[PDB]
From a paper:
To understand the molecular basis of the inactivation of dimeric EcHsp60, the crystal structure of the naïve EcHsp602 was solved at a resolution of 2.35 Å. The dimeric structure of the naïve EcHsp60 (EcHsp602) revealed a twofold symmetrical conformation, with two protomers facing each other in an asymmetric unit. The N-terminal (MIS and residues 1–87) and the C-terminal (residues 508–552) regions of both protomers were not observed in the density maps because of their disordered structure, and only a partial equatorial domain was built in this model. The equatorial domain of the naïve EcHsp602 showed greater flexibility compared with the apical domain, as indicated by a higher average b-factor. The α4 helix of each subunit protruded out from its equatorial domain to interact with the adjacent subunit, with the interface mainly composed of van der Waals forces and hydrophobic interactions. Two intermolecular polar contacts were identified on the α4 helix of each subunit, involving residues T89, E100, D103, R444, and D494. The RLK motif (R264-K266) located at the α9 terminus formed four hydrogen bonds with residues from another protomer, including E212, R264, L265, and K266. The T89 forms hydrogen bonds with D494, occupying the space of the ATP-binding pocket, and the D85, G86, and T87 are disordered, leading to the inability of EcHsp602 to hydrolyze ATP. In contrast, neither the naïve nor the mature EcHsp602 showed any ATP hydrolysis activity at any ATP concentration. The oligomeric conformation of the R264AK266A mutant was confirmed by negative-stain TEM, which showed that it formed a heptameric ring structure similar to the WT naïve EcHsp607. These results suggest that the RLK motif is crucial for stabilizing the dimeric form of EcHsp60.
Numbering used by the authors:
A (entry chain B): 114 to 479, 514 to 533
B (entry chain A): 115 to 479, 513 to 533
The structure:
């Protein structure tokens, strides 16, 4: 391990010699104060995107003036909402189609990247899958194998949603997926506290499944039967998101669940609890906008589907945090805000000066004319670079 | 835009911190010092040649485990200090040693999506087919008939070619990911005529045929089952490929070895003697298989990791020797830094960085429990810092 100690010294003593004994913690503090100040200024320059027109304008310039892509995006955002669920699919027709189907999305991705089965976009895509819902963590082999056996003997992919999947249970899932191509994926349950348990129950109703380990039934995972699984017509899991389309739950059961949420909505004075109940109610009642891209051939629609997805993600990022001048002009215009920064040391000065000098570089390398970048993209680009 | 920002922060960050120093001249001083240090390392190194010295190194790298040191030294007694040694799980209580036929070359899988074993990021197959090609593989229709033959015989397929790219690689990746197609692609080793010779050597060892060669010119589409090579066991990492128990007959292997020893006789080039001797060791010399036993699968997996670590440290020690004293040995290289002739103030800085870091490993003083340091591990760590 002499090699490991020697490498950490060259890195450590390399800073002290080059910087003439500067404090790295205070330099990092200078970078963080400058970055926070630039981002705060970025929120000032940003212009919101909420109106249907200015959404279409942003969506049009997001697709390089395709108009057809811009209008099919704004039309989807009209029928499903500014923050509604929109997904892109391959249409078998000549023109672009828009359809609203049953489904929902939540912000948790696959627990392991080995569950990837689609290199394009690094996603896990299944059709007609089983859904295993667990209110407790799944850590042991004994608690996950019976569910794998039933799914595998039915030749149905298996989506597992639990508080967490770790330990030997996760190792077993990765082993079978990698070694013998078992169609399986595991994701963490969204939310916290009772809201997490309620969201799990909502999935069971929407997909016709059962939640294991809940306080009510106390169903053991080793006693799983086939009908305990939920059913999903289509699954699409990325490293950040999970999309469940066309659940197997009957519309009557969905409606009774919406009635309980409506009852709780009139039984609380808390604004936060109402916010969570309304998010759950919308996930159950609202659908998913599906953009079916059409064209002349199967090779052309695949190329057009990508340009639609890229314009879709950029438009979604604009309705979130707004838009700023593109070409690096926004970062160049946040530089004078750094002169107001009150630091303590000369090392904090160095950190600010590093940001002050680097903000000109992206612009030096390069609204009504389409020269626009979304605020979210330019802000996260600065946080990750720093 | 995020990479430009990240590079701009690193570039302008070094300037602001170093008060306007030349990064090239500093790096030149770092590499100049590392060069002289490595010279003193090799002069000070002690070789590992004797069976007792090999076992001593393996025992210390096994935390004093004499049994692990014994089985590593025994494996080297049978296949030589530079022979191929692999580690496997054993079905008995103790460790076994088995000499089998096989070969290993320094080319890994073309895409990490071919991994089917998370532990060590490996692709492992048993009783597999081997497709060999002197030309690049790019089209799907060229490999589609080879795939159906492998699917009909229910055999994994290893593809060793000049390269596998284009739509052929993408559909191989897509089929592996989506439907669990057991396939892996590896670049052919060597260059020029030597690469053609090693490919033909692989065909003889496995009983297959090289497609697209200059002698026959067999097309990939005219493939028949007997054109495949047969391998008993395949282990492919990101850097290496191990083919065990090839299906070639002993007679054709003896003939191929007779051609190499004939060319070995009529050559004076030490580099060509090395190239032909490397080919002869692959075709003739055997592979040592260490089967690690235990009373439980947890103990076997744990012991297999310690045997692998001790083996890697022993192989590194056999190649370049061991460092006597470990950290204290780097102290004898510091006086050699005082003779380096620097040019500009930034070059003296780079030398001073190394002079500071070398003093540390001894200043801190595993070492009390007895550890050795292979000269290769220390040398590569110094080069990786410059």
């Amino acid at each position: 391990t002499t090699a490991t100690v020697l490498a950490r010294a060259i890195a450590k003593e390399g800073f002290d010699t080059i910087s003439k004994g500067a404090n790295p913690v205070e330099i990092r503090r200078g970078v963080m104060m400058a970055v926070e100040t630039v981002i705060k200024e970025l929120k000032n320059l940003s212009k919101p995107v909420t109106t249907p027109e200015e959404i279409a304008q942003v969506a049009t310039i997001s697709a390089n003036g395709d108009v057809e892509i811009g209008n099919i995006i704004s039309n989807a955002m009209k029928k499903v909402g500014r923050k509604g669920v929109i997904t892109v699919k391959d249409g078998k027709t000549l023109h672009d189609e828009l359809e609203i189907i049953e489904g929902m999305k939540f912000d948790r991705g696959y627990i392991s990247p080995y569950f990837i089965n689609t290199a394009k976009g690094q996603k896990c895509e299944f059709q007609d899958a089983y859904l295993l819902l667990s209110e407790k963590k799944i850590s042991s082999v004994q608690s996950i194998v019976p569910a794998l056996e039933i799914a595998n003997q039915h030749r149905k992919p298996l989506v597992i949603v639990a508080e967490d999947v770790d330990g030997e249970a996760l190792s077993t899932l990765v082993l079978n997926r990698l070694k013998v191509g078992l169609q399986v994926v595991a994701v963490k349950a969204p939310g916290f506290g009772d809201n997490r348990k309620n969201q799990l129950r909502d999935m069971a109703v929407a997909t016709g499944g059962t939640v294991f380990g809940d306080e009510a039934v106390g169903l053991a995972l080793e006693d799983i039967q086939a009908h305990d699984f939920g059913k999903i017509g289509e699954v699409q899991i990325t490293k950040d998101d999970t999309l469940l389309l066309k659940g197997g739950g009957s519309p009557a059961e969905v409606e009774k669940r919406a009635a309980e949420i409506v009852e709780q909505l009139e039984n609380t004075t808390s604004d936060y609890e109402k916010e969570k109940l309304n998010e759950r109610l919308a996930k159950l009642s609202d659908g998913v906008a599906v953009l079916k891209v059409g064209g002349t051939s199967d090779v052309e629609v695949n190329e057009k589907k990508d340009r639609v997805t890229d314009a879709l993600n950029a438009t979604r990022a604009a309705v979130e945090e707004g838009i700023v001048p593109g070409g690096g002009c926004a970062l160049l215009r946040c530089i004078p805000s750094l002169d107001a920064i009150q630091t303590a040391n000369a090392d904090q000065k160095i950190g600010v000066e590093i940001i002050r000098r680097a903000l000109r570089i992206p612009a030096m390398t390069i609204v009504e004319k389409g020269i626009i970048d979304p605020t979210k993209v330019v802000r996260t680009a600065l946080l990750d670079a720093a």
